[PDB]
Amino acid sequence: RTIQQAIDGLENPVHYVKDVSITPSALLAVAVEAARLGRTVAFGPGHYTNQGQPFEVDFPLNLDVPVGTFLDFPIIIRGKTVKMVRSVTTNLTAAQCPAGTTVIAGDFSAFPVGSVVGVKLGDNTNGSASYNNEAGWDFTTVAASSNTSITLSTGLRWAFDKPEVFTPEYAVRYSGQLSRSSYFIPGDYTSGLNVGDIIRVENIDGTDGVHGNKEYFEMLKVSSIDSSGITVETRLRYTHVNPWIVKTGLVKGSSVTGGGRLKRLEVRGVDTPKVNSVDVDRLIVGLCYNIDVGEITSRGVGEPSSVNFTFCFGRGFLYNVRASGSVSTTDNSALKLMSCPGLIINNCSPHNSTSTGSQGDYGFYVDAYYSPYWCWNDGMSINGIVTETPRSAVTRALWLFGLRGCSVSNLSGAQVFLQGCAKSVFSNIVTPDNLLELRDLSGCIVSGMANNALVLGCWNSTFDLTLFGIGSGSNLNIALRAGAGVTHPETGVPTTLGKNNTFNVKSFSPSSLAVTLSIAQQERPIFGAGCVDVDSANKSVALGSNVTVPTMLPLALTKGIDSGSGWVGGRTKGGIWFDGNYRDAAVRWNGQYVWVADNGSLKAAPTKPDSDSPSNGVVIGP
Amino acid sequence: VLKDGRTIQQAIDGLENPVHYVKDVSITPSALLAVAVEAARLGRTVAFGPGHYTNQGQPFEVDFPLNLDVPVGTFLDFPIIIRGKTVKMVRSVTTNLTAAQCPAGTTVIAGDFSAFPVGSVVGVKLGDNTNGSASYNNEAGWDFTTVAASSNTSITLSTGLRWAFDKPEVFTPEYAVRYSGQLSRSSYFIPGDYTSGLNVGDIIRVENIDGTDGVHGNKEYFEMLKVSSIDSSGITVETRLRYTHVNPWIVKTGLVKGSSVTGGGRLKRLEVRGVDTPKVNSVDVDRLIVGLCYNIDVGEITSRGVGEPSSVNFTFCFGRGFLYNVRASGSVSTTDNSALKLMSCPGLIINNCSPHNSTSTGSQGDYGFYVDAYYSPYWCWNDGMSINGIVTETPRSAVTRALWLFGLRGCSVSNLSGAQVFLQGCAKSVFSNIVTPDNLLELRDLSGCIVSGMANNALVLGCWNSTFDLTLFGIGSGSNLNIALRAGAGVTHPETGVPTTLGKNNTFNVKSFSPSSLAVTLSIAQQERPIFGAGCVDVDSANKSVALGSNVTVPTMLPLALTKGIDSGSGWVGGRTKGGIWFDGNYRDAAVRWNGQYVWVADNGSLKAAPTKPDSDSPSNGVVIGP
Amino acid sequence: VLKDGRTIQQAIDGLENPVHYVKDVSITPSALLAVAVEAARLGRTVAFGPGHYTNQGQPFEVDFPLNLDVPVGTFLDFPIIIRGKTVKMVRSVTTNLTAAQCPAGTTVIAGDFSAFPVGSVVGVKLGDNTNGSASYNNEAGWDFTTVAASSNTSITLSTGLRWAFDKPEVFTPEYAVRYSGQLSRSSYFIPGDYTSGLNVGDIIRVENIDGTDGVHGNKEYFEMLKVSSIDSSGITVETRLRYTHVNPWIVKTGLVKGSSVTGGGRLKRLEVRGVDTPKVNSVDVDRLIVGLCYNIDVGEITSRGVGEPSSVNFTFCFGRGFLYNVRASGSVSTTDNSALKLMSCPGLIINNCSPHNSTSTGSQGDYGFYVDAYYSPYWCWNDGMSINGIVTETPRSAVTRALWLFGLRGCSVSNLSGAQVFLQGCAKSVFSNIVTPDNLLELRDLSGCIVSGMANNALVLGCWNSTFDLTLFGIGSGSNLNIALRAGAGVTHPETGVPTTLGKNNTFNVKSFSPSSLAVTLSIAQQERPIFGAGCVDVDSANKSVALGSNVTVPTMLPLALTKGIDSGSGWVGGRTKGGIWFDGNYRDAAVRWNGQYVWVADNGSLKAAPTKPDSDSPSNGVVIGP
């Protein structure tokens, strides 16, 4: 009967998964068939648990997950970080494969002498920050191989746990410098690369990492190629010296949308992933290009992060994200980004982060160190981050580290830490109940309002702050404290004195204990014309150890200011116009009030004159 | 008949009419309700075919999740109301009484209350059939107390009603407990044993009684919170408290678990009330109301209005919400209201709203955008909002005010443009990138705020510890006639509620570029220690640069670039500095003008003075003050 | 084999081939049009199954609403053009005349115009087969006049054509009336009786003739407005007028009522022209053009380009639009153009645009982001836009300028980063959070603007009543060699159009941190009353702090933190203050450096001077000025 066949077909659309009991292998076959067409797999209502197994694909996945569908199992889309011809896994420990290792045991017969070989951490280890390698890739050449060992031509830069050793499909050493902001890489790569391929550029000898470190890399998409060189779709973010150029195998697109719920989604190694309008309890996006992720909610799964983004390159968008429910024992964050240059971030609202010991679990954290790598967060635009204090002994809530050339605005709710940033603007910071902590910023502009503030180090920076209170702990009774730095963020030079920082502080604490500004370990601090405090305070300017060339413009501080011969005042052409008579052009100067009288003479008196000729007045001249 | 026993007719009928798809514009209200009930059983969407649906003219109301897909070509032309339980109740009695029959302080209410046990918790709300009245301070209030007596003809409350109630509805909460002590703002753990009534995922109402953390120090305010863990020692909530409460009631709500409306089509009227995590996105809604919800997500909305005082409202939305890409218009009011109106939505991120075509009939206004903290009786702070990107136009009204923000604290606000802004009664907030060059900028009773941008002219009333960094292009035409920036008296400190008429410690950095020969750059009255900063500029066509009115004390000035008259007096305070100043020049460019002299250090090191600006180091009208 | 009328095969065939689902990539252009016409009757979507559709290589053009659902896996690889009527017409005559044959001032046009009555309104547009030419100032112009003579061989216009036209098309509008007098910007009511030609919901074109409210005071500008109410006394419009018009034409348009393209898939080329409220969202569009639309909503778009001078552009969009989350790339030009290009879009909110990979072949540029107000002949202001979040990179071109904003007024702009910004010919706008530390920041002919952020170095040309608050890290390498901030001559005031070479009353607060021994912090010429504010800073490695060039008058300085040479002269003006100053110290830290002396008040109250900074209160080189 054709009618029965027709109705059976109508009741069971291809590409519509509606049986929660679909086997893992049948679900995989659905996804394989959809990918041949490039179309979506859609789901009917229900609670799907996939026999408790992860569902992993290495090809494009386009899911429509509607309201009423819960995909309650791990879904992992995983492309190839480096495209490989062969690989040998290993169970050596980091102690058996320490930094500088050149000989690795295993069956390496098929690895030709002189070929390029790469080494990565095994897929069943997280490595360790203790030997500075949780995410590292190393490239070198084969000096010798046998069915018992391989000899590398240069030693491994870091220790590896469970090293996996492989031959890249296409990997070439560049001789010379690829400068940041370039778009053309000279050379003949036509034997290995095509338009649309994504390459990894792995620095070896350059120093354009955070703190001047040499471990960093970036991904780029080839937009043109000929025998003279390749052009890439976005300009280089970092300067590389003698890098490796390596072909990746990122998956060509993937998407997850629809309004339903996913327990755990991992999107790794994808070119142009989209994740939008879903509830994802745990979301991980890593080693991707041109991401677009937004309108996401995430309740967490009790892991140290709930949503994180790692090594995302190109021009990404991250918007309208509510993330929560993370629990950590070491530093981590509900919403966490690590080295995502060029990303636009708009409107993130994290909350309910918890730490169970002595370290933090932040609401929002942008970090540039993922051992071994120190890739700058170059050129990010961040607007609209609303936080609350972690449920933690650590009250820090929002932490930005390793940003350069970034525009940052509208940060509110809980304690902000800005650390190790360069040439960036941070405005509309609104955290009136909290400390604002600032460390080792170079050429930054910081403005907004807080309870109290701490500046450690910093160079050529401006701090334009309204402060409502004073410190309670290491900054006890001080509205703004400045102290020693540690490291210049771009050069990595150890540096304890801050230099040339401008302070425009309006301090409104009504406490009789308040010390408006307490400054130490600073060269040429500048106290600007915008400084204000009120006369209930205890002290206006306390200068401590190692302050040199302190500089002041006329301001509206009301209580004690420390003295000394090193003060530099304002400088001007044109004089000044003291526009007044004895009433309102009397200049207070040491123990006198000095004024020009109505008859043109210069006078002085030890108390403010109530006439042009007070009885305690004297004529200076003529 | 088919292999599974069904006839062909049933199989095609089901394919041509899926249970969750509504394509018949003539579907009855009862049949539509049955569709919605069945979709809620499966947690899934009801989708519509094209057509103009009127539901026999009837409102369509549900008290369970509704998830609608309303595509382009579908017009749901009937009210749709999703209504959860603001407080979960085990019994309730409605009355017919007016507010005059149930005044403030009432303890005895007529009706059949025989099932209300003495000593149980009893609540009173306005009936759903009244809006109350701001005239007795109660449009939205809830009161909780205990039963002191009950019978089949009246009930006696242990404490008198806080406000009068119209049509009071008297009820037993399913779970309500009185807390003894303070719950501080920014806490996340509430001590006590709530395990007999609460579970993880429940939403609770915390109703303040004795605390003063409302706007103006008022005692009427509340918030909602979601329970994230519970044990016999206390509950934790998934967002920290926004307000400090003292001896509050802790009350279990019955918010609906989710709901959504999406799809590209058009709805005449959508009310989303008492929903945990509602989503409304990518629809045209003529009248949208979202009220008493948690963790909202509303965006990509257009609204043409229905000629009512507001077109789009958000009221009492708690947790962490998003509101974005909204175009609203078409409202008509007789008393103050707004096309897009928000009342007490702490923690909300608002991005890109573009209201227009708002109209008022009388002497009050119909604003484009209004964030308000007073919804009588409540004064819940708009604490911790982030607002970016609001474009307004002048209402069609006697009142030119277009964008009004009241009762914000700890808020980051930026990018407000197009028509007249009023900031009122805000604290510890930043308002930047204000761009309203054709309009007055009005600022009243701000405490610890920073306000920057550009306008035609400006008015500062009161304010404490605030900074006004403004470029102004014109001068006032009415109550601020010919003044670029006027400062005058305040009314009330916003946090403490203390009546206060003098502003204090405000910084003014005003660049005033009106070319009018009538312009007065700054006209300052009723201010203690106003500070005229180094950023002040005007131009020498002005009539006057600084006029000082009544009750100005300790006026303070830093060296600046104002060019016309400045009022004199012995109370002026100048800038203070270490290091002296370097007057870097000789007689031509280090001559200091001082009263009627020019004073300079001559090339031989002597100090000279002359009554006109010196054209040489030794003018014939020069005098040596000394060597 | 029957159901209730229909055969079972009918029903099965209907279900296997639903009528609004296009799933056959072989569908003919005629059949696809018929699907679109049927959907428009219902106002519903056309949805596509997966596949690569090429429409037999034909453009697909409609002049009625189109609502497409284009899902992931669908590629519509052919041009799709939705085109409403810019002006509704009742007759039109096309010609093949060249611009030399129809020069500016032309009153007589050959052709069969026997159907055009003397005294009726006639309009002239460029033919649809021409682009015109900027060389005779007309790529987009419309002219309206009356018929003075007509016959089967020519028409005579009552007034000469304002510009030359190539292939002029001559037509009678359906409804066009001349307004006598001024329609002021910001108004909403247009007096007169238009009921014979207009209804609520119509969109009108207001074409200025005699007003001067264009950029540079030019007379060529127009806007579109939607009628929200009408009676016999006048019309009301949904949004207030953006421009002031004098003796304009009021012309009825035929904009299409709605259209939309969504769904996740890919389109080769989409042109949306003459549409009331188009929506384009969540699609990949290689080339996207949106022009002459009202209340646009375009967002979540990616565009890889087609190698044309622009990839995505918006022209003449009115009302209240949104543009958001756009990644555009792949443009290639030989004359100025931009990957993402906007021309005259007043009132538009723009949020989060990330253009890249733009290329130009010769001496002009191909920018990443460009907002322009000149599209010949028109100079319509970009009035009241809000722009936030633009990330650029340097074009692959000899021109390094990457982001160019021209002809903005009343705009709030923030968060511009990544590559070289040019702000030109803007008025009464704020531009903040500019972060381009590797690049020149170029600023020309700004009036009443506030510009803040950080760059490598900066150039200010002209400008009036503006503020430049900048941190600079380097110095120029070419035209601005060795200078951190250079100021020079302007050209034109942007609002009045008055030719003006001197800037006036600009405030410079520059913090310059170049460590180069060549650095000149400020090099100022062609400026009246430049103000060097109290926020200026440099470091003492620099060569020079302030170099004054030709035509600097009334240079004004407040006490600041510049450390190297400042040019001298008698025209310097210092700060002004009430209350004196408190030099709070003794000989150590209240010594005033003054010409070649240090002056201080000694502990005994006498005034002293010494030629070196004093190391005691009575140095051996000191002198008592007086007691």
Backbone phi, psi, residue B542, to 5°: -70, 160
Q: Out of B429, B569, B576, whose CB is closest to A430?
A: B429
A427 vs B: CB within 8 A: yes
Q: Parallel, antiparallel, or unpaired for β A416-419 and A425-439?
A: parallel
Subunits that touch chain C (at least 3 Cβ pairs < 8 angstroms)?
A, B
Q: Say which residues have a Cβ less than 8 Å from residue C440's Cβ, sequence separation at least 6.
A: C400, C420, C455, C456, C457, C458, C459, C476, C480
Which residues constitute the domain of residue C205? 177-252
SS3 at position A18: coil
Cα separation of the two ends of chain C = 125
Q: Out of B2, B3, B412, whose CB is closest to A412?
A: B412
Q: CA C563, CA B304: separation in Å to the nearest integer?
A: 60
Domain contains A16? no
| Range 488-507 of C in CB contact (< 8 A) with B | 505, 507
- CA distances (Å), origin A352, targets A183, A298, A390, B206, B297: 43, 11, 7, 19, 19
Strands (E), C274-321: 275-294, 297-303, 312-318
Q: Are C99 and C136 in contact (CB under 8 A)?
A: yes
SS3 at position B595: coil
What is the widest separation between alpha-carbon atoms in chain A? 124
Q: Which helix (H) or strand (E) holds C11?
A: helix C8-16
Domain contains B558? yes
Best mutation site among C581, C593, C624 for testing chain A: the one with the most A CBs within 10 Å?
A: C581
Which residues is A465 bridged to in the sheet? A448, A505
Let me know if A573 is exposed, middle or buried by CB neighbors in 10 A (0-12, 13-18, 19+): buried
Query: What tokens appear for A47 in the block?
Result: 């609670």
Q: Parallel, antiparallel, or unpaired for β A198-202 and B573-577?
A: unpaired
Q: Domain check: are C164 and C227 in the same one? A: no
Q: CA C616, CA A474: separation in Å to the nearest integer?
A: 38
Q: Say which residues have a Cβ less than 8 Å from residue C554's Cβ, sequence separation at least 6.
A: C528, C529, C571, C573
- In terms of Cα–Cα distance, which of C348, C358, C280, C269 is closest to C67? C280
Q: Are B43 and A45 in contact (CB under 8 A)?
A: yes
- ∠ at Cα C442 (C436, C448), nearest 5°? 110
Query: What tokens appear for C425 in the block?
Result: 């010919």
Let me know if C37 is exposed, middle or buried by CB neighbors in 10 A (0-12, 13-18, 19+): exposed
Q: Out of C391, C566, C601, whose CB is closest to A344?
A: C391
Tell me if C388 and B388 make a contact (CB, 8 A cut-off): yes
Domain contains A405? no
Domain contains A325? no
B11 vs C: CB within 8 A: no
Half-sphere exposure of B443 (CA within 13 A, CB side): 34
Q: CA C293, CA C278: separation in Å to the nearest integer?
A: 7
Q: CA C175, CA C194: separation in Å to the nearest integer?
A: 9
**If you count DSSP H runs as helices and E runs as strands, how many of each does chain C have, helices first?**
2, 55
Handedness of CA C177, C181, C182, C183 (dihedral sign): negative
Q: What distance lies between CA A34 and its chain's CA centroid?
A: 36
Q: What is the DSSP string of B509-522?
A: EEEE----TT-EEE
A125 vs B: CB within 8 A: no
Q: Are B34 and B64 in contact (CB under 8 A)?
A: no
Q: CA A567, CA B581: separation in Å to the nearest integer?
A: 11
SS3 at position C37: helix
Q: CA B546, CA C577: separation in Å to the nearest integer?
A: 11
Q: Parallel, antiparallel, or unpaired for β A217-226 and A592-596?
A: unpaired
A570 vs C: CB within 8 A: yes
Q: Are C393 and C364 in contact (CB under 8 A)?
A: no
Q: Are B304 and B284 in contact (CB under 8 A)?
A: yes
Q: CA C497, CA A249: separation in Å to the nearest integer?
A: 57
Q: Domain check: are A462 and A560 in the same one? A: yes
* C-alpha dihedral, A381 to A387 to A391 to A395, nearest 10°: 70
Q: Say which residues have a Cβ less than 8 Å from residue C112's Cβ, sequence separation at least 6.
A: C93, C152, C153
Count other Cβ atoms within 10 Å, centred on residue A547: 21
Q: Domain check: are B196 and B159 in the same one? A: no
Q: Domain check: are A462 and A494 in the same one? A: yes
- ∠ at Cα C210 (C209, C213), nearest 5°? 95
Subunits that touch chain B (at least 3 Cβ pairs < 8 angstroms)?
A, C
Domain contains B343? no
Q: CA B305, CA B324: separation in Å to the nearest integer?
A: 18
Q: Are A245 and A263 in contact (CB under 8 A)?
A: no
Query: What tokens appear for B254 in the block?
Result: 């019955």
Q: CA C394, CA B15: separation in Å to the nearest integer?
A: 56
C67 vs B: CB within 8 A: yes
Specify whether the backbone of C554 is left (phi greater than 0), alpha (psi in -120 to 50) or beta: left
| Range 89-118 of C in CB contact (< 8 A) with A | none
Q: CA C13, CA B16: separation in Å to the nearest integer?
A: 12
Residue type, C551: N
C578 vs B: CB within 8 A: yes
Query: What tokens appear for C497 in the block?
Result: 């159009």
Subunits that touch chain A (at least 3 Cβ pairs < 8 angstroms)?
B, C
Q: CA B274, CA B322: separation in Å to the nearest integer?
A: 17
Q: What is the DSSP string of A26-42?
A: HHHHHHHHHHHHT--EE
Q: Domain check: are A536 and A456 in the same one? A: yes
Let me know if C403 is exposed, middle or buried by CB neighbors in 10 A (0-12, 13-18, 19+): buried
* C-alpha dihedral, A162 to A166 to A170 to A172, nearest 10°: 70
Tell me if B394 and C591 make a contact (CB, 8 A cut-off): no
Q: CA B563, CA B545: separation in Å to the nearest integer?
A: 7
Q: Domain check: are A505 and A601 in the same one? A: no
Tell me if C582 and A587 make a contact (CB, 8 A cut-off): yes
Backbone phi, psi, residue C185, to 5°: -60, 150
Q: CA A464, CA B469: separation in Å to the nearest integer?
A: 13
Q: CA A21, CA A17: separation in Å to the nearest integer?
A: 10
What is the widest separation between alpha-carbon atoms in chain B? 124
Q: Are A291 and A325 in contact (CB under 8 A)?
A: no
Say which CATH number the domain at C189 has. Answer: 2.40.30
- CA distances (Å), origin C65, targets C81, C83, C274: 11, 9, 11
Q: Domain check: are B187 and B169 in the same one? A: no
Q: Domain check: are A453 and A546 in the same one? A: yes
- In terms of Cα–Cα distance, which of A340, B433, A235 is closest to C368? A235
Among residues B252, B279, B311, which one ends one of the domains?
Answer: B252
Domain contains A289? no
- ∠ at Cα A38 (A34, A44), nearest 5°? 45
Query: What tokens appear for C60 in the block?
Result: 């697909």
Domain contains B496? yes
Count other Cβ atoms within 10 Å, centred on residue C432: 26
B583 vs C: CB within 8 A: yes
- In terms of Cα–Cα distance, which of A553, A547, A552, A424 is closest to A490? A424
B586 vs C: CB within 8 A: yes
- CA distances (Å), origin C86, targets B571, C293, C448: 66, 9, 35
Chain C nearest C-alpha distance from B476 (Å): 18
Q: Domain check: are C599 and C569 in the same one? A: no
Sheet containing C527-528: give its strands across: C503-504, C527-528, C552-553
A318: nearest CA partner in chain C:
C325
Count other Cβ atoms within 10 Å, centred on residue B393: 27
Radius of gyration of chain A (CA): 31
| Range 260-289 of B in CB contact (< 8 A) with A | 260, 262, 277, 279, 281
B608 vs A: CB within 8 A: no
Helices of type H across C468-574: none
| Residue that has been written with the tokens 């810019």 in this structure | C86
Best mutation site among A295, A571, A578, A596 for testing chain C: the one with the most C CBs within 10 Å?
A: A571
- CA distances (Å), origin A247, targets A61, A244, B504: 22, 10, 65
Tell me if C627 and A606 make a contact (CB, 8 A cut-off): no
A588 vs C: CB within 8 A: yes
Q: CA B72, CA C261: separation in Å to the nearest integer?
A: 11
Count other Cβ atoms within 10 Å, centred on residue C362: 11
* C-alpha dihedral, A458 to A427 to A416 to A386, nearest 10°: -160
| Range 289-348 of A in CB contact (< 8 A) with B | 295, 297, 320, 322, 324-325, 346-347
Radius of gyration of chain B (CA): 31
C283: nearest CA partner in chain A:
A274
Q: Domain check: are B162 and B191 in the same one? A: no
| Residue that has been written with the tokens 């600022």 in this structure | B443
Count other Cβ atoms within 10 Å, centred on residue A268: 22
- ∠ at Cα A250 (A246, A253), nearest 5°? 150
Count other Cβ atoms within 10 Å, centred on residue A207: 15
Q: Domain check: are A119 and A185 in the same one? A: no
A236 vs C: CB within 8 A: no
Query: What tokens appear for A489 in the block?
Result: 């963020």
Which residues is B560 bridged to in the sheet? C576
Q: CA A546, CA A564: separation in Å to the nearest integer?
A: 13
Domain contains C335? no
Q: Out of C16, C453, C585, whose CB is closest to A590?
A: C585
Size of interface A-C (CB pairs under 8 A): 268
Specify whether the backbone of B304 is left (phi greater than 0), alpha (psi in -120 to 50) or beta: alpha
Which chain A residues are Cβ-neighbours of C535 within 8 angstroms? 502, 528-529
Can you give the resolution of this entry in Å?
1.6
Which chain B residues are Cβ-neighbours of A581 within 8 angstroms? 568, 595
Q: Are B95 and B103 in contact (CB under 8 A)?
A: no
Query: What tokens appear for C114 in the block?
Result: 């026997």
Among residues A168, A194, A211, which one ends one of the domains?
Answer: A168
Q: Parallel, antiparallel, or unpaired for β C552-553 and A522-523?
A: unpaired
Among residues A135, A168, A201, which one ends one of the domains?
Answer: A168
Q: Say which residues have a Cβ less than 8 Å from residue A218's Cβ, sequence separation at least 6.
A: A200, A201, A236, A237, A238, A313, A341, A375
Q: Out of A68, A352, A430, whose CB is closest to B412?
A: A430
Which residues is C230 bridged to in the sheet? C235
Domain count across chain B: 4
Q: CA C12, CA C21: separation in Å to the nearest integer?
A: 15
Q: Say which residues have a Cβ less than 8 Å from residue A363's Cβ, sequence separation at least 6.
A: A333, A334, A335, A350, A351, A353, A387, A388, A390, A397, A398, A413, A414
Question: What does DSSP assign to residue C378?
Answer: B
Chain B nearest C-alpha distance from A252 (Å): 28
Half-sphere exposure of B258 (CA within 13 A, CB side): 14
Helices of type H across C132-212: none
Q: Are C458 and C434 in contact (CB under 8 A)?
A: no
Q: CA C94, CA A242: separation in Å to the nearest integer?
A: 64
| Residue that has been written with the tokens 């709070």 in this structure | C584
Chain A nearest C-alpha distance from C615 (Å): 8
b/e sequence B542-562, b meaning 16+ C-beta within 10 Å: bbbbbbbeeebebbbbbbbbb
Q: Domain check: are B571 and B494 in the same one? A: yes
Question: What does DSSP assign to residue B344?
Answer: S
Q: What is the DSSP string of B38-69?
A: HHHHHT--EEE-SEEE-GGG--EEESS--EEE
Specify whether the backbone of A405 is left (phi greater than 0), alpha (psi in -120 to 50) or beta: left
C563 vs B: CB within 8 A: no
C388 vs A: CB within 8 A: yes
- ∠ at Cα B83 (B80, B85), nearest 5°? 175
Residue type, B361: T
Q: CA C2, CA A3: separation in Å to the nearest integer?
A: 13
Sheet containing B154-157: give its strands across: B89-94, B168-173, B121-126, B142-150, B154-157, B108-110
A583: nearest CA partner in chain B:
B570
Query: What tokens appear for B610 in the block?
Result: 């002359």
C330: nearest CA partner in chain A:
A233
- CA distances (Å), origin A366, targets A300, A454, A463, B389, C306: 18, 20, 21, 25, 36
- ∠ at Cα B43 (B42, B46), nearest 5°? 90
